[PDB]
Structures are given as structure tokens and as C-alpha cells.
Amino acid sequence: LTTFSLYTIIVLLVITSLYTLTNNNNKIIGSRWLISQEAIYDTIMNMTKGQIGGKNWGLYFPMIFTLFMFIFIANLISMIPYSFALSAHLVFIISLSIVIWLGNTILGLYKHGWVFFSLFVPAGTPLPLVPLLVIIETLSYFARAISLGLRLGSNILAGHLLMVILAGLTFNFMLINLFTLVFGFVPLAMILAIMMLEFAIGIIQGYVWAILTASYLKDAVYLH
């Protein structure tokens, strides 16, 4: 058995613990636990309605929902001090980005094929930089791939280990002589600010994931 797969089971138990215990007997009125999910559904709905802007825009709206929520929930469990890192396995998150990027390329080649390679020319340019504009495009084409993964877990792995080693700060500050208890309130507020940063580096970075791959969905579905 692995603690990581057990953490994924805890994630699915919280997923059960977000809607079933939320919904009091299928009521119209929309209780307080359901208002948050309503706000999430609306802020993803109105987002990707304007983002990809397609006639077929909602057809990937569940996907752009469910790719968010995993990062939304897995950065609500590692927030506990006595916990192990959930999404800081960079092989896993970068491999997720690889899966999403390759699914985008297969979608674009199944939808467009040879004219999907018409994405390489953004605008009409004079001759001595017409192919070069393609190349820096191709140079960005895997950079479109690699960065979004290599920009999520490296957030989270930078956060909590920080709160490990700066806990070691409190193991290096409150273990020297007794006047360390005098004006020793500012590392407490500093780690407080780091936790304020950590909720941001979970939630807003998950939204960054969502918005960047939503742009990539408009890239792969629509040829410019």
C-alpha cells in the first residue's frame, strides 16, 4: 500500500463530502455549502464561455471543470502541517500536462490535420523572417507543453518544504538563549504570511492551470 494512493482515496471521499452531505434533500433554495459550488461553477462557466468562445464551447467545459478541482482539492489537504505533499510530485503533474498537451495535439490533428500546421504562421510577415517565426513558434510549441506542469508542483514543493525548513528556523531561533522569547513574535507572523501565501499558491495557481490550458484549448480547437 502507498500513502499517495490513500491520499487520492481521501480526495474522492472529500468529493463525496462536497455534494451529498451538502444537498439537503434536493432543495431549490441553495444552502450555504452549495453557494460555494455555485460560485465555482459560475466562475468557470463565465470564464470558459469567454475564453475559448466557441459555438462548441461547453463541450470541454466539464473537462476544464474537472482538471481544476483536482488541483483545488489536493492543495487543501497538504495545507495541514502534519501531512505529506500531494501535488508536489513533479513527475505526476508534469506527466498530467504531457497528457493534456498530447490530447490537444491529437484533437487538433483529428479536427484539422495538415491545416492544423497552419498555426505556425500567426500573421503575414516579410520574407527574411517568415520561416524563423515558425521556428520560435516550434520553440514555444513544446514550451506551451512543458511549462504549465513545470509551474504548478514547483510552486507547491517550494511552499511546504519552506514551512518545513522555516519551522527549523523556529527550531534554530527558540532553542538559543531565553531572550529569544523577547520580540520572537515576528517569525510567527512571518509563517502566518507564508500560510496566507500558501492558500494563494494552491488556489490561484490551480486557476492559472485552468486558464492556461483553456487558452491552449482555444489554440488546439480553433486555428487562430
Q: Which of residues 144-203 bind other proteins (CB under 8 A)?
A: 144, 147, 151, 154-155, 157-158, 161, 163, 165-172, 174, 188, 190-197, 200-201
Cell of 82: 502534519
> Out of 122, 181, 184, 223, which residue is the one contacting other proteins (CB under 8 A)?
122
DSSP per-residue string spanning 1-39: --HHHHHHHHHHHHHHTTTTTTSSTT-SS--HHHHHHHH
Give the total of residues touching other proteins (CB under 8 A): 94
- Minimal distance, residue 37 CB to other proteins, in Å: 7
Q: 209 near 148, Cβ under 8 Å? A: yes
Contact positions with other proteins (CB under 8 A) in 7-66: 8, 11-12, 15, 19-20, 23, 28-30, 32, 34-35, 37-38, 41, 50, 53, 59-63, 65-66
Give the CA distances from residue 93 to residues 26, 77, 156, 157, in Å, rounded to whole numbers and listed in that order: 36, 16, 11, 12
207 binding other proteins? (CB under 8 A) = yes
Q: How far is the CB of 129 from other proteins (least distance, A)?
A: 5
Question: Which residue in 114, 124, 127, 183 binds other proteins (CB under 8 A)?
Answer: 124
Measured distance CA(58)–CA(123) in Å, rounded: 28
CA 62 to chain CA centroid, nearest Å: 15
Residues 102-121 that bind other proteins (CB under 8 A): 102-103, 106-107, 110
Instruction: Classify 27 in phi/psi space as left (phi over 0), alpha (psi -120 to 50) or beta.
Output: beta
151 Cβ contact partners less than 8 Å away, ≥ 6 residues apart: 205, 208
Given the rule CB under 8 A, which of 112-120, 177-185, 204-212 is the region that contacts other proteins? 204-212
Minimum CB distance to other proteins, residue 75 (Å): 13
CB of 32 to other proteins, least distance (A): 4
